Design a protein around this motif. Structure first.
Motif, PDB file in Angstrom:
ATOM      1  N   UNK A   1       0.837  -1.191   0.000  1.00  0.00           N
ATOM      2  CA  UNK A   1       0.000   0.000   0.000  1.00  0.00           C
ATOM      3  C   UNK A   1       0.877   1.247   0.000  1.00  0.00           C
ATOM      4  N   UNK A   2       0.645   2.136  -0.968  1.00  0.00           N
ATOM      5  CA  UNK A   2       1.468   3.332  -1.105  1.00  0.00           C
ATOM      6  C   UNK A   2       1.220   4.368  -0.018  1.00  0.00           C
ATOM      7  N   UNK A   3       0.330   4.108   0.944  1.00  0.00           N
ATOM      8  CA  UNK A   3       0.210   5.010   2.085  1.00  0.00           C
ATOM      9  C   UNK A   3       1.522   5.107   2.851  1.00  0.00           C
ATOM     10  N   UNK A   4       2.371   4.080   2.751  1.00  0.00           N
ATOM     11  CA  UNK A   4       3.642   4.077   3.462  1.00  0.00           C
ATOM     12  C   UNK A   4       4.668   4.995   2.823  1.00  0.00           C
ATOM     13  N   UNK A   5       4.438   5.424   1.584  1.00  0.00           N
ATOM     14  CA  UNK A   5       5.438   6.192   0.862  1.00  0.00           C
ATOM     15  C   UNK A   5       5.744   7.494   1.592  1.00  0.00           C
ATOM     16  N   UNK A   6       7.028   7.846   1.632  1.00  0.00           N
ATOM     17  CA  UNK A   6       7.525   8.972   2.404  1.00  0.00           C
ATOM     18  C   UNK A   6       8.574   9.687   1.567  1.00  0.00           C
ATOM     19  N   UNK A   7       8.576  11.019   1.568  1.00  0.00           N
ATOM     20  CA  UNK A   7       9.526  11.756   0.722  1.00  0.00           C
ATOM     21  C   UNK A   7      10.965  11.475   1.126  1.00  0.00           C
ATOM     22  N   UNK A   8      11.749  11.007   0.153  1.00  0.00           N
ATOM     23  CA  UNK A   8      13.144  10.661   0.399  1.00  0.00           C
ATOM     24  C   UNK A   8      13.953  11.858   0.890  1.00  0.00           C
ATOM     25  N   UNK A   9      13.626  13.065   0.418  1.00  0.00           N
ATOM     26  CA  UNK A   9      14.419  14.241   0.753  1.00  0.00           C
ATOM     27  C   UNK A   9      14.287  14.646   2.217  1.00  0.00           C
TER      28      UNK A   9
ATOM     29  N   UNK B   1      14.488  -7.284  -4.591  1.00  0.00           N
ATOM     30  CA  UNK B   1      13.173  -7.894  -4.439  1.00  0.00           C
ATOM     31  C   UNK B   1      12.933  -8.319  -2.996  1.00  0.00           C
ATOM     32  N   UNK B   2      13.958  -8.876  -2.341  1.00  0.00           N
ATOM     33  CA  UNK B   2      13.806  -9.343  -0.964  1.00  0.00           C
ATOM     34  C   UNK B   2      13.518  -8.191  -0.005  1.00  0.00           C
ATOM     35  N   UNK B   3      14.178  -7.049  -0.202  1.00  0.00           N
ATOM     36  CA  UNK B   3      13.893  -5.888   0.635  1.00  0.00           C
ATOM     37  C   UNK B   3      12.469  -5.399   0.410  1.00  0.00           C
ATOM     38  N   UNK B   4      12.003  -5.450  -0.836  1.00  0.00           N
ATOM     39  CA  UNK B   4      10.614  -5.111  -1.117  1.00  0.00           C
ATOM     40  C   UNK B   4       9.658  -6.070  -0.414  1.00  0.00           C
ATOM     41  N   UNK B   5       9.984  -7.366  -0.403  1.00  0.00           N
ATOM     42  CA  UNK B   5       9.125  -8.339   0.267  1.00  0.00           C
ATOM     43  C   UNK B   5       9.147  -8.161   1.776  1.00  0.00           C
ATOM     44  N   UNK B   6      10.278  -7.714   2.322  1.00  0.00           N
ATOM     45  CA  UNK B   6      10.350  -7.385   3.740  1.00  0.00           C
ATOM     46  C   UNK B   6       9.379  -6.256   4.073  1.00  0.00           C
ATOM     47  N   UNK B   7       9.333  -5.228   3.218  1.00  0.00           N
ATOM     48  CA  UNK B   7       8.376  -4.140   3.394  1.00  0.00           C
ATOM     49  C   UNK B   7       6.938  -4.633   3.274  1.00  0.00           C
ATOM     50  N   UNK B   8       6.682  -5.562   2.349  1.00  0.00           N
ATOM     51  CA  UNK B   8       5.330  -6.091   2.187  1.00  0.00           C
ATOM     52  C   UNK B   8       4.888  -6.887   3.410  1.00  0.00           C
ATOM     53  N   UNK B   9       5.808  -7.638   4.024  1.00  0.00           N
ATOM     54  CA  UNK B   9       5.461  -8.425   5.206  1.00  0.00           C
ATOM     55  C   UNK B   9       5.177  -7.513   6.395  1.00  0.00           C
ATOM     56  N   UNK B  10       6.021  -6.498   6.608  1.00  0.00           N
ATOM     57  CA  UNK B  10       5.783  -5.554   7.696  1.00  0.00           C
ATOM     58  C   UNK B  10       4.454  -4.829   7.514  1.00  0.00           C
ATOM     59  N   UNK B  11       4.137  -4.420   6.281  1.00  0.00           N
ATOM     60  CA  UNK B  11       2.871  -3.739   6.028  1.00  0.00           C
ATOM     61  C   UNK B  11       1.690  -4.675   6.259  1.00  0.00           C
TER      62      UNK B  11
ATOM     63  N   UNK C   1      10.459   4.382   1.188  1.00  0.00           N
ATOM     64  CA  UNK C   1      10.794   5.097  -0.040  1.00  0.00           C
ATOM     65  C   UNK C   1      11.065   4.057  -1.122  1.00  0.00           C
ATOM     66  N   UNK C   2      10.141   3.928  -2.078  1.00  0.00           N
ATOM     67  CA  UNK C   2      10.263   2.943  -3.147  1.00  0.00           C
ATOM     68  C   UNK C   2      10.577   3.535  -4.516  1.00  0.00           C
TER      69      UNK C   2
ATOM     70  N   UNK D   1      12.032   7.061  -6.917  1.00  0.00           N
ATOM     71  CA  UNK D   1      13.026   8.109  -6.822  1.00  0.00           C
ATOM     72  C   UNK D   1      14.415   7.634  -6.454  1.00  0.00           C
ATOM     73  N   UNK D   2      14.629   6.325  -6.359  1.00  0.00           N
ATOM     74  CA  UNK D   2      15.913   5.785  -5.984  1.00  0.00           C
ATOM     75  C   UNK D   2      15.803   4.393  -5.393  1.00  0.00           C
ATOM     76  N   UNK D   3      16.869   3.931  -4.743  1.00  0.00           N
ATOM     77  CA  UNK D   3      16.847   2.587  -4.155  1.00  0.00           C
ATOM     78  C   UNK D   3      15.925   2.525  -2.948  1.00  0.00           C
ATOM     79  N   UNK D   4      15.452   1.314  -2.660  1.00  0.00           N
ATOM     80  CA  UNK D   4      14.395   1.125  -1.674  1.00  0.00           C
ATOM     81  C   UNK D   4      14.913   1.369  -0.258  1.00  0.00           C
ATOM     82  N   UNK D   5      14.139   2.118   0.525  1.00  0.00           N
ATOM     83  CA  UNK D   5      14.448   2.398   1.920  1.00  0.00           C
ATOM     84  C   UNK D   5      13.252   1.996   2.772  1.00  0.00           C
ATOM     85  N   UNK D   6      13.506   1.260   3.850  1.00  0.00           N
ATOM     86  CA  UNK D   6      12.463   0.823   4.773  1.00  0.00           C
ATOM     87  C   UNK D   6      12.663   1.558   6.091  1.00  0.00           C
ATOM     88  N   UNK D   7      11.671   2.352   6.480  1.00  0.00           N
ATOM     89  CA  UNK D   7      11.748   3.201   7.664  1.00  0.00           C
ATOM     90  C   UNK D   7      11.028   2.505   8.809  1.00  0.00           C
TER      91      UNK D   7
END
Length: 301
Positions: free
Chosen positions: A23-31, A73-83, A98-99, A101-107
């Motif tokens: 769910x893109x509700x998790x998206x957060x501005x990288x800057x 892909x694994x980091x993306x799946x980690x984000x999917x499991x937490x969500x 942050x998915x 604008x650049x490489x994936x970041x999990x906050x």
């Protein structure tokens, strides 16, 4: 791969975490991220301390530049499991991501006291059972919170597979939070993980059916919780101390050998360990039973 799994009725089987929704509700501005010190690092990733503007101090998980396509892909799946898991006080919770604008970041939430194992070893010669000393009151609360967090994971059809004091973080107000380092921890440098086949496994924490039959279940998580309790009331001692993982060790476990009670474990807490270590998975308590049992102990204390 030593990490969390969500299971579905098949008899359960692991779900493919790539198939979970993000769910893109998790998206957060990288800057709005200011990065600080590196808190930990594995072969392919790291967690860094960071300041989040408009989300506070947070932990940000990211990959290292040498990561292959499968690990992104694994980091993306980690984000999917937490969500998917949602929020609970006794796990390290997802805060944002942050998915694009650049490489994936999990906050995620930040725990300032580090992992619970090093904390116990730090406080070992500053412990008194009763009266900033570590006390029996603290160890009971820690046992209670980890059981609550594990009960929460189980209620979401999630099995940890690597429950241990090294994977519990401690934050302010003595809140313990279960976590999955994943790509931020390389187990090849840890003697607590043992080569077995091609895999590297935390043998001294694993239930017998996991070791000898490759079976991971809610009940095998309970076994590992009993080992965690031993770590907790031994003030961070290594399990089966002085025992090499060899043919003799496997045979002893298979024939019913279990650890003795830690010096500072109340008899009621050792009773829980012994039931967690029942050779029959059906006779082990559930995490919900453990939560209620420890709740009664804290009331009596």
């Amino acid at each position: 791969e030593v990490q969390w799994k969500v299971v579905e009725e098949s008899n359960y089987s692991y779900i493919d975490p790539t198939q979970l929704p993000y769910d893109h509700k998790w998206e957060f501005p990288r800057n709005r991220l200011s990065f600080g010190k590196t808190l930990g690092a594995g072969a392919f990733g790291k967690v860094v301390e960071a300041t989040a503007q408009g989300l506070m101090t947070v932990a940000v998980k990211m990959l290292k530049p040498s990561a292959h396509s499968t690990e992104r892909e694994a980091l993306m799946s980690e984000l999917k499991v937490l969500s998917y898991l949602g929020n609970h006080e006794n796990i390290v919770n997802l805060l944002g991501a942050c998915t694009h604008g650049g490489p994936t970041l999990v906050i995620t939430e930040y725990c300032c006291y580090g992992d619970l194992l090093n904390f116990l070893r730090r406080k070992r010669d500053e412990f008194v059972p009763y009266k900033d000393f570590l006390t029996l009151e603290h160890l009971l609360s820690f046992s209670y919170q980890v059981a609550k967090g594990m009960a929460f994971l189980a209620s979401k059809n999630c099995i940890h597979r690597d429950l241990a004091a090294r994977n519990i973080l401690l934050t302010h107000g003595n809140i313990t939070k279960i976590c999955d380092f994943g790509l931020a921890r390389d187990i090849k440098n840890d003697s607590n993980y043992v080569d077995k086949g091609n895999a590297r496994l935390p043998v001294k924490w694993m239930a017998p059916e996991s070791i000898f039959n490759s079976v991971y279940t809610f009940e095998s998580d309970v076994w590992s919780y009993g080992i965690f309790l031993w770590e907790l009331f031994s003030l961070g001692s290594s399990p089966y101390p002085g025992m090499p993982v060899d043919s003799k060790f496997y045979k002893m476990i298979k024939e019913g050998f279990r650890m003795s009670s830690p010096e500072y474990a109340p008899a009621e807490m050792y009773d829980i360990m012994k039931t967690c270590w029942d050779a029959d998975p059906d006779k082990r308590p559930t995490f919900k039973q453990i939560v209620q049992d420890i709740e009664k102990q804290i009331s009596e204390s």
